[PDB]
């Protein structure tokens, strides 16, 4: 049976449907981190032109179909769609179709054969981000504490300047 080519063949296949894909910008590059699959993708902040993908008509259809189903299933009662879908070319050869959300409150892409490089990025970021947040609070608390002790040393010196001066002077 004969059928048209463009709507029958694709050069990209839908891999994963992420419900929560947080996008952040730091170091001059967007970082799409998914907490569900524990993966982090890096891009160049420039929307990869979908027209550049050879035989990629199935990608506007597949991406929009998943977005509509996911939005109505979970984000209809709490979030709102902002703009149209955005396609970004991530490091390693992964094309990410992104749909920003807000709270009510010609060539062929070569995909790498291992996503473990991205999983390590998420794991390191998931351990570095909090540990640094807790290293930052401890440092802040220590400084606030030291400034608090000065109120006691200013009075302890009068009681016995010999002992206070000895430990402070060295």
């Amino acid at each position, epitope marked *: 049976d004969w059928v048209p080519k463009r709507p029958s063949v694709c050069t990209m296949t839908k891999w994963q449907e992420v419900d929560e894909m947080l996008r952040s910008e730091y170091g001059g590059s967007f970082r799409f981190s998914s907490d569900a699959i524990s993966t982090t993708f890096t891009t160049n902040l420039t929307e990869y032109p979908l027209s550049r993908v050879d035989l990629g008509d199935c990608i506007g259809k597949d991406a929009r179909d998943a977005m509509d189903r996911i939005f109505a299933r979970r984000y209809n009662a709490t979030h709102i769609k902002v*703009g149209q879908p955005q396609y970004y070319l991530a490091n390693g050869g992964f094309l990410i179709a992104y749909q920003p959300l807000l709270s009510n409150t010609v060539e062929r892409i070569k995909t790498t054969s291992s996503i473990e490089f991205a999983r390590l990025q998420f794991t390191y970021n998931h351990i570095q981000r909090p540990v640094n947040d807790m290293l930052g609070r401890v440092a802040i608390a220590w400084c606030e504490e030291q400034n608090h002790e000065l109120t006691l040393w200013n009075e302890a010196r009068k009681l016995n300047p010999n002992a206070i001066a000895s430990v402070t002077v060295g």
Partner: antibody
Amino acid sequence: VQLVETGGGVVRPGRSLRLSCTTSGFSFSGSAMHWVRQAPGKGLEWVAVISHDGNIIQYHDSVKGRFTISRDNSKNVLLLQMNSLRVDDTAMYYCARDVWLLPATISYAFDFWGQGTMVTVSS
Amino acid sequence: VIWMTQSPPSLSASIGDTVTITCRASQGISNSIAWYQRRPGKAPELLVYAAYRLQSGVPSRLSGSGSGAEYTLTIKNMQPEDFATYYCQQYYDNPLTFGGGTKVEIK
């Protein structure tokens, strides 16, 4: 907020015309701009869009390849260079800013509209 | 191109009554749709976004609803300043298309 458009007038078919839209009251560099037309006694129709920084441009199938949208963030002025005009292009052109909901996304909706100017194609 | 069918093209209402304007698209657009208002002699002004988000400063008595390819805009208490042309525009896929428009007038 205030939006003003300049460059309208009567032009012969197949000729070029360039419109300009001045802005004030909002961060022009932080919001995308859109162009809308209103034919006499007809409905509204979108023309084109220019991102906040102008990196991406999108046009309507009825004006793709004929029009040319551009912006100058330094002078906070929007422009739409028109070429190869046709009789069907006779309409009131309005310049409108997108709805700011997120920092760099394009809402593809209109929140502020200008006074509009006429562009009549006659011979 | 996603055609936008808006009806009724024209209807009349009295001050202090309920009205409902229906807008239909040629294909399912989830919730990507906006509503506008254009008073005589003035430029249009946005009212609702994504079929449910009311714009800042818009009266709370005016609200929209619907899903898929069916959408509606309702006003529970008409005021003299509400009589104007209302347009429904979609942004699910390019090119952006507006509705036929419905002119609410005094009856």
